[PDB]
């Protein structure tokens, strides 16, 4: 439903679903796959609206957790979140 | 003995008495925090021209 970014949104299935399905295409190219993903900008303007749209195209196990204070301010509950996640 | 104990070595210690039992392992593999030192990097002869 959300269009207009399709020029920059070509990476939705290329940077997410493509390496999980076909892993031999990156070997037939020779460039590093889009592993690290960083997105900077105002949230809620369609930046985050695209994030919630990933689960629709995927329809699989999806984990969305916002770390802000999610790490503890005292010893040992922080390391709980550092590992096992 | 004290002659065979190298500096910064992982050993074993008792719970209540804290007595040293035996030397378990050696110095940890990772050094400091962020180590960018690289010998013979990925660039050998031709990577960036000019």
């Amino acid at each position: 439903d959300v269009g207009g970014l399709d020029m920059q949104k070509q990476e939705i299935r290329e940077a997410v679903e493509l390496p999980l399905v076909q892993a031999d295409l990156y070997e037939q190219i020779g460039i590093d796959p889009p592993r690290g993903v960083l997105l900077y900008g105002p949230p809620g303007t369609g930046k985050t609206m695209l994030v919630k749209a990933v689960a629709n195209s995927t329809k699989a196990a999806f984990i969305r957790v916002n770390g802000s204070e999610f790490v503890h301010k005292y010893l040992g509950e922080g390391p709980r979140m550092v590992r096992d996640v | 003995n004290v002659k065979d104990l190298k500096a910064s070595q992982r050993v074993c210690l008792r719970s209540d008495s804290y007595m040293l039992h035996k030397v378990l392992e050696n110095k940890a593999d990772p050094l400091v925090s962020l180590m960018m030192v690289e010998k013979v990097p990925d660039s050998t002869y031709d990577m960036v021209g000019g």
Partner: protein, 400 residues
Amino acid sequence: NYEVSEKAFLLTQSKVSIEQRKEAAEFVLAKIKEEEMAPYYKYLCEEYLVNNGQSDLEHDEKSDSLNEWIKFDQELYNELCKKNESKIKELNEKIQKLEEDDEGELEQAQAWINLGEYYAQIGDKDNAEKTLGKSLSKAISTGAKIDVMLTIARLGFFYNDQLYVKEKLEAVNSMIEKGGDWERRNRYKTYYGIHCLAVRNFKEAAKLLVDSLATFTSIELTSYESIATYASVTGLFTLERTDLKSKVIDSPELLSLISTTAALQSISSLTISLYASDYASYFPYLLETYANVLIPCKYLNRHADFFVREMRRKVYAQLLESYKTLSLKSMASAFGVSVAFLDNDLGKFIPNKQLNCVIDRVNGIVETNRPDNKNAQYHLLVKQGDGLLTKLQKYGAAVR
């Protein structure tokens, strides 16, 4: 220097097409005057007896090529000695100014690189291998090792060996780093399928030798017309008829060959006759392709007629599965073949376990069968009877 490599070999494998040998002969005498190579031009003449249609008159009377002299004589030494010992002592003199002053890590390595490559033009044995390793130890990167690899890679057309060429380069090729290197794919996949041509596996070469990533050839390894020829010849033997339209014509390399070089003749003959399942037209194109492809072929020319007789029936064997009841003389008379010779080749394929089908002669009722059953299902265990116990009772003598 790929032209020197191919013309020093192809002349041996051609017993037909005098015009084809002239290109493998007239292009030798012209280049040997420029080069320094005495012995490797003589080794070509050392193989004479027990051959067909050579270019020289010594023991036999033939010499059917237009160039009648392949012999090595002392007349080559006129222009040979000019650039032979002059450039060796000159380039080695620059090395004296290298190790003393220790200028750069390239100049010490590039010196022997300009030597080992030039030693191939001198035609020396130990100088093109042992002394070339001096620069191999100075440069540990895999990028500079290509010249060391290409020197041994071109020995396949020099010493004429399909075995020890990759054996000496096996440790050099593998190493550690592999990755997605493009130039390494053309070097490994080309020579890999060549070694399997004697074993006749052909399956591991279908996705490697037959399938070429580069549209144009690699020069010093093989030829553009040669790399496109082996894809059609071997591809029809391995890939089925369904994969013919999904792969061979799918690749753009074939579309460029159709509109340029029609001399192969296998694109409009073996491909169309197999796709249309027409044995009548497929028969006369066997010898026409055999003459212009398999005879000039530099690899499979050794074993040819037996390789053709196998694929000759396979075109008709697949068509047999389509029809249930067919007489002997109905469509076979229009195919342009004789009934007597048709049964002779098929009669010898019975001990090879290549016929489960129904073939009859005196009556002529010809049917098809189902090679998938519970007989060949159990045959896997019988074949492993003597092969599984070979090493079990061997080393169990002193140990265990």
